[PDB]
TrEMBL record:
Protein name: Uncharacterized protein
Domain of life of the native organism: Bacteria
Length: 94
C-alpha cells in the first residue's frame, strides 16, 4: 500500500545511513558503537521483512526501543538519529 511504501522508503533511508556510519565510524564514535549500530540495523531489517510478509504487529507492539535510546543518548543534531526516528515512527504509524 501507499502507507507501507512510505515506510519501506524511510526504513531503507535509515539502513543506508547506518551503513554510512559503519563505514565512516570516526564520525560517530563519540556517541555510538558498531555493536549498537548493528543492533539498530537488525531491528529495521526485521521491520522490512514483516512488511514484506504482510505480518506487521498490531499498533501496540511496534516499539523497537531504538527511538528512545537515540533521544536519550545521541546528540540532538545527529542527522542519523533523525533518519532512524523517522523510520521507527513511520512503522509505528502503520
Amino acid at each position: 500500500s501507499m502507507k507501507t511504501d512510505n515506510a519501506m522508503k524511510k526504513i531503507k533511508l535509515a539502513i543506508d545511513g547506518i551503513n554510512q556510519a559503519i563505514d565512516n565510524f570516526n564520525e560517530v564514535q563519540t556517541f555510538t558503537t558498531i555493536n549498537q549500530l548493528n543492533h539498530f540495523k537488525e531491528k529495521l531489517m526485521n521491520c522490512e521483512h514483516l512488511i514484506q510478509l504482510n505480518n506487521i504487529p498490531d499498533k501496540s507492539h511496534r516499539n523497537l526501543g531504538i527511538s528512545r535510546i537515540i533521544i536519550d543518548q545521541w546528540p540532538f543534531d545527529s542527522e542519523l538519529g533523525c533518519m532512524i526516528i523517522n523510520a521507527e515512527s513511520e512503522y509505528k504509524s502503520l
